[PDB]
Amino acid sequence: EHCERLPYDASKWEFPRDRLKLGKPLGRGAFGQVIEADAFGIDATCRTVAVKMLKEGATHSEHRALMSELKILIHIGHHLNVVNLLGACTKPGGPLMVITEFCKFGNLSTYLRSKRNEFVPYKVAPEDLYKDFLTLEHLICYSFQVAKGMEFLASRKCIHRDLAARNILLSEKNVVKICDFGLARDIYKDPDYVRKGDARLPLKWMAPETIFDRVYTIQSDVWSFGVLLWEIFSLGASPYPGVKIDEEFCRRLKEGTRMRAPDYTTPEMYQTMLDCWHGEPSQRPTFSELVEHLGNLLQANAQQDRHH
Numbered sequence: 001e002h003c004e005r006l007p008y009d010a011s012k013w014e015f016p017r018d019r020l021k022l023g024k025p026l027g028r029g030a031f032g033q034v035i036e037a038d039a040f041g042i043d044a045t046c047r048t049v050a051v052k053m054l055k056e057g058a059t060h061s062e063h064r065a066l067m068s069e070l071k072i073l074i075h076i077g078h079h080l081n082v083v084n085l086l087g088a089c090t091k092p093g094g095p096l097m098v099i100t101e102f103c104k105f106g107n108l109s110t111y112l113r114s115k116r117n118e119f120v121p122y123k124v125a126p127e128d129l130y131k132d133f134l135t136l137e138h139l140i141c142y143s144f145q146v147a148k149g150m151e152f153l154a155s156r157k158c159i160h161r162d163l164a165a166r167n168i169l170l171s172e173k174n175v176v177k178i179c180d181f182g183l184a185r186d187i188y189k190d191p192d193y194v195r196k197g198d199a200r201l202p203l204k205w206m207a208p209e210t211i212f213d214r215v216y217t218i219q220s221d222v223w224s225f226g227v228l229l230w231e232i233f234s235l236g237a238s239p240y241p242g243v244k245i246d247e248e249f250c251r252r253l254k255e256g257t258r259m260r261a262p263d264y265t266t267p268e269m270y271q272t273m274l275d276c277w278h279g280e281p282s283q284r285p286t287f288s289e290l291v292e293h294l295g296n297l298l299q300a301n302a303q304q305d306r307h308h
């Protein structure tokens with residue numbers, strides 16, 4: 001009933017299906033799927049891409065939902081720190097297909113968890129002992145990038161609504177990208193999504209006003225960003241460790257209960273998390289302010305690493 005019906009620029013976005021060779025499925029959702037593919041001449045060069053399309057026997061409403069996803073991607077536009085649309089297959093002859101840039105390291109949560117034994121706060125010479133290690137610089141840099149992607153999203157007058165580390169993808173050269181799997185995520189088989197009424201909701205990432213009043217704003221996205229920071233500086237742990245996500249949890253959150261400092265945080269990063277978790281939405285920092293602050297922390301962190 002909405003976004004799928006926005007105008008489409010075929011001369012800009014249309015990619016020939018014949019120039020696309022589909023390979024292995026990457027991820028399987030409730031309605032749609034993401035498939036690894038080789039594409040030729042998308043940017044006379046071959047490139048690995050991610051192709052979102054619908055599963056066999058998709059309904060009309062599922063078709064509408066994928067088209068709505070495509071139009072939202074187009075509206076948002078290009079930024080380094082957002083998963084970028086490379087093209088689309090919308091013409092008669094074959095299925096609706098959305099082609100985005102391939103991020104080879106996958107989601108940030110799983111990736112960070114794989115590096116628990118490959119993290120040092122700062123490398124020490126000889127640095128080859130810490131080859132491919134994560135450092136404080138990496139984590140602050142990831143945080144900084146997501147804040148810039150979220151500032152960009154805000155400037156498009158968009159609200160994410162599902163900001164989390166599972167929705168951050170890691171590309172080449174330590175470049176992180178904000179995304180949403182949407183139709184290609186199975187939220188009914190995902191423990192991050194909790195049943196509250198008719199819907200499955202990411203309760204551990206949701207601001208109190210969102211939980212109680214159903215209010216989604218850019219300011220509740222900032223709350224979510226604070227939970228993401230906690231995920232980054234726990235190296236991909238799950239929020240509110242061991243805590244039952246019930247009525248008591250929601251009550252205590254409204255009353256001012258917050259998560260403790262995660263294992264790999266700096267004092268400055270933890271205060272930033274707490275700032276993002278202000279009970280008053282108006283009192284949370286903006287994403288512009290988060291970009292500024294995290295830029296300052298990235299800079300301060302560099303002064304702690306001066307060997308070279």
Ligand SMILES: COc1cc2nccc(Oc3ccc(NC(=O)c4c(C)n(C)n(-c5ccccc5)c4=O)cc3F)c2cc1OC
Pocket residue numbers: 026027034050051052069070072073076082083098100101102103104105106107153160169178179180181182
């Ligand atoms: C190696 O492992 C993988 C690499 C992968 N690499 C790239 C892509 C992959 O899957 C996808 C993930 C996300 C999306 N995103 C969309 O379709 C998006 C839409 C419609 N909007 C509106 N947004 C958006 C953008 C900004 C802010 C709010 C939402 C979207 O991100 C598309 C995908 F194909 C991968 C899956 C992998 O395994 C599962």
